[PDB]
Amino acid sequence: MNIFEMLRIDEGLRLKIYKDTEGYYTIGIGHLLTKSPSLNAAKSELDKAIGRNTNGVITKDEAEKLFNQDVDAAVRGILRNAKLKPVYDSLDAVRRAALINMVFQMGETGVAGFTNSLRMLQQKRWDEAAVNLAKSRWYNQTPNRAKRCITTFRTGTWDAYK
Ligand SMILES: [Cl-]
Ligand SMILES: [Cl-]
DSSP states (O other): OHHHHHHHHHHOOEEEEEEESSOOEEOOOOOEEEEESSSHHHHHHHHEEEEEEEETTTHHHHHHHHHHHHHHHHHHHHOOOTTTHHHHHOOOOOHHHHHHHHHHHHHHHHHHHHHHHHHHTTTTTTHHHHHHHSSSHHHHHHHHHHHHHHHHHHHSSSGOOO
């Protein structure tokens, strides 16, 4: 298991524009296109992202390419963020994956806001952080995915994904 496989399980793969759990236009492997309520606006963001007139449909290769870019950006965002970096540096490889997953789903800003949980992870208080992470809109809105990520931070293994 690795970050790519992990996220492919959590996000799935769709080659036509779809709406995510929050109702936002998305495509591929969880690639958010726009928060705007307009399909046209989504189609336009899509074309600009792919570099061709797509008509809301992409190939598997194109989906994976957006995916590689998105994981790279998530890592880079973590490394550039003053609150996230130190946490990431302190963690083992498996738990780092869980932090990347959260950033991919919610953005750097979103994750950076889990101040208390972050401090707990940095201190390696696994059970405490898992409880704190669960007291969030994130857990309440997407509980199964949240539980998978939390179990990962709690155990340091891939058990939730196997
Ligand atoms: Cl893009
Ligand atoms: Cl979920």
